[PDB]
Symmetry: C4
């Protein structure tokens, strides 16, 4: 029999967290990742769940996530270490029948608990499930370096920020045609920042936390990591261009419109209008 550590989802969590560590996006415990699973994903491994159950209440009831299993990163845990000890740094949790709390079925050994950003994660999963008819399955947060730097210089406005990111790499509009939501700075690890993030997730797959980092949503680990990597790559280009004194030329509005038409996407109107 297959060890749960060799499962597609444990291996995928290891790959995404390790890749993000190597990118320089996740110093110390700066990042968190949650992946929504099906019962059918974890059923073959149920002898691993065979447990003195651990139950933890949610800060807010989440009835839409009733009975739903997730694999999640732990509070205070380092992305760098996930590859070294998956069961210490990751846990499989299942939200209970009423959405009032969850059991820790596997992992998060030695009294570890899920990420302190669980509200932002679970509330965003809720909104993304509604927004995508259940197709989005991943919420990823990291401290993407160039995106963070840009939050000190670009206006903290969805249209302006989205438009610069679209201009800074051709495929950006195709990968995130709904653009990038941006919050004011907020104290992290709170219900409030969770709820503010989730409200932006209704209309965007990416949300920026100024002076902090980024949240992304997608259907798979690779597509979510790739979404963030695309925005961060554009941010990296922009930081270089702005450091050289700014753009002498760029992708025009008309060109962005043509791009959207070709790829069958409706670009965020506010960003396109600039």
């Amino acid at each position: 029999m297959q060890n749960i550590t060799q499962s597609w989802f444990v291996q995928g969590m290891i790959k995404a967290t390790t890749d993000a560590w190597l990118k320089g996006w996740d110093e110390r415990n700066g990042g968190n990742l949650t992946l929504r699973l099906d019962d059918a994903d974890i059923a073959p491994y149920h002898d691993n769940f065979h447990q003195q159950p651990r139950y933890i209440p949610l800060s807010q009831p989440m009835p839409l996530l009733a009975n739903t299993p997730f694999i999640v990163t732990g509070s205070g845990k380092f992305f760098r270490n996930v590859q070294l000890d998956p069961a210490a740094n990751l846990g499989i949790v299942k939200v209970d029948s009423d959405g009032a709390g969850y059991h820790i079925l596997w992992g998060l050994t030695n009294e570890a608990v899920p990420t302190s950003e669980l509200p932002a994660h679970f509330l965003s999963h809720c909104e993304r499930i509604k927004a995508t008819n259940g197709k989005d399955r991943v919420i990823m947060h990291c401290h993407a370096t160039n995106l963070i730097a840009l939050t000190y210089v670009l206006e903290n406005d969805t249209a302006v920020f989205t438009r610069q990111l679209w201009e800074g790499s051709t495929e950006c509009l195709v990968v995130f045609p709904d653009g990038v939501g941006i919050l004011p700075w907020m104290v992290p690890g709170t219900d409030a920042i969770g709820q503010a993030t989730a409200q932006e997730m209704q209309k965007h797959s990416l949300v920026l936390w100024p002076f902090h980092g980024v949240f992304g949503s997608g259907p798979t680990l690779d597509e979510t990591f790739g979404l963030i990597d695309t925005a961060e790559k554009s941010a990296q280009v922009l930081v270089k261009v702005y450091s050289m004194g700014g753009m002498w030329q760029t992708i025009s509005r008309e060109e962005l419109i043509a791009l959207g038409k070709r790829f069958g996407v409706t670009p965020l109107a506010s960003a396109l209008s600039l």
Copy 2:
């Protein structure tokens, strides 16, 4: 018997795509690579081709590529993943007797198809075969970070851009004496951008897509990767120099002329004249 995955060409595709991933040039699916093979390369592996054939028509007939096999990266596929599952992310294709389409002989599993930039690739192979009497065998596209940044600041002009790249690392003129072609921004994944790229490939081994990336051509995977790496290294130096306020000194015209003479190359006259 040798598995096809251990072949020189599958191993080479893995090395080039993995190296480019590690460079930060190929976020998400941002990049594509095609390598022209001989019948003699794939003949020893023909039991791997033993197939429910898949046939796909080309958007434009390419009679010059009749009967020609290639190994290619897939549409929507991540350079990061090639090492993890070569058969999922790569395919061996063979253009048919008339050049009207190709069979997928191996790989591109689960209904995967070749890169969306196949026109730019195949049309460029055609022009490079003519330009080099059949010596060029590789077309590589990636999202080379500093080259991209420079397209927002340097004039989008072959002579000017070539000349700065030559100045930004001594060996540039020796590695690409024909210089760098540069298109206007165009909607990607089209016949039009393919044909525009191929027309520049007649007179240059490197072609820039502003605000997007670079295409390179060469006789081997290493020489093509190395060509791009050289241009991108010069671009990296230039981005640093421009960020520091610009050049106080540089390689002179006379010095570039002397360099060309020593290495027995005829540098692009327009770039040399500046």
Copy 3:
């Protein structure tokens, strides 16, 4: 029986030094690391200590460290090489009953000796033991690139430097609420620089050596590495922002105060007052 090289502490020293090498923080011999152990940590491995003893006097008596074992990096040794030959590059030392010197129990083969920055390390351990009621166990020095660059541009003042680092990544105030001490430039490898560093370690977990690097203290290798990585990440963001012409917006004083309250930390008053 377990080889000492497979011990948690030898493996941890290898991980931290290798990670720091990969970060670009430790060119040549530029860095040093010391970890305070318990007798119980090394007792299971005592057959490895079975030795023609080597004894080296300390430059200054350190009675508070009497009888205390440490694992340490060697003088003139490369962080890059620790993974290749742990016993050549690391040593287990034990401070004697009076604190007048130490024995080299294991490692530092071929007449190697502990780091030339041993005074800064051991004196800082002393002050951190007092400051944290024995909870801090690690002193790490490296040449963190962006922190070094910032010492040429930011005022060399604890309040100003701390405040910018807090602003450059949200979690900074939470990770180092006591802020960052900063010395004037001093000749390294001396008792004087050791004593100056230790005096700052009384009131901060991080101390900057202008035009040189950083010292950090924490309870574990990961928490100490993570502390430095956090400060250096903020420094990296700031270098990008300053290169783009400076901040247009940032985390406010009020926001920093709110952050401190939420995380139950008392931020350094001088930095908070700006």
Copy 4:
């Protein structure tokens, strides 16, 4: 019996070239490395030399290197590939009794030849042998990115350039107290550039080729790589500082003098006088 590929010197060449590749210093074939061996180093492996000899004349007789064996990188070879096929990319050569040429005893398979920069290497070895009473054994050339960028902005003057590098990391004066020689731009791969480099090697362990790269000399692979890594790290810091608008404070002349005194080195007078 030990394969020659497992020898200390083949393994060391692999480590240095691979490390330099990972640094981004050696795109394409941009770099070369030569290590002077003793007869006693290669004697245990002589059954590997058992050969249809290959002999190649030197461009200039080098009687001081008579009978001397070296391990060297090949012309047109990629540092990236050394780890994949050491015998293809490296060769063991022995200069003949008169210094008129050398035999290729091992490696450089498929008619490969030593680096095109052999004059710069061998002539520099000659001068460094004289300068250090035979202690220096390595000449390394690479395309160190930040050092290259600085050659477009700093005055191309030994005193000025040395002084900035000393200021940009404290240990620089200790690692290269003799400073950094700097040539005018010259056509590479020539006897002339070789002889110009060697003349600077009489009085410095580092020599800059503007708009091209750096040459370094030292007693071991690690000390030579570390020398270059130190200068390049300082260059990296300086590029960041200059990009942020320049130094507000720095290491003073008096401080550099104090540093030299403490470490028992005589710093280059011209650089110290600024």
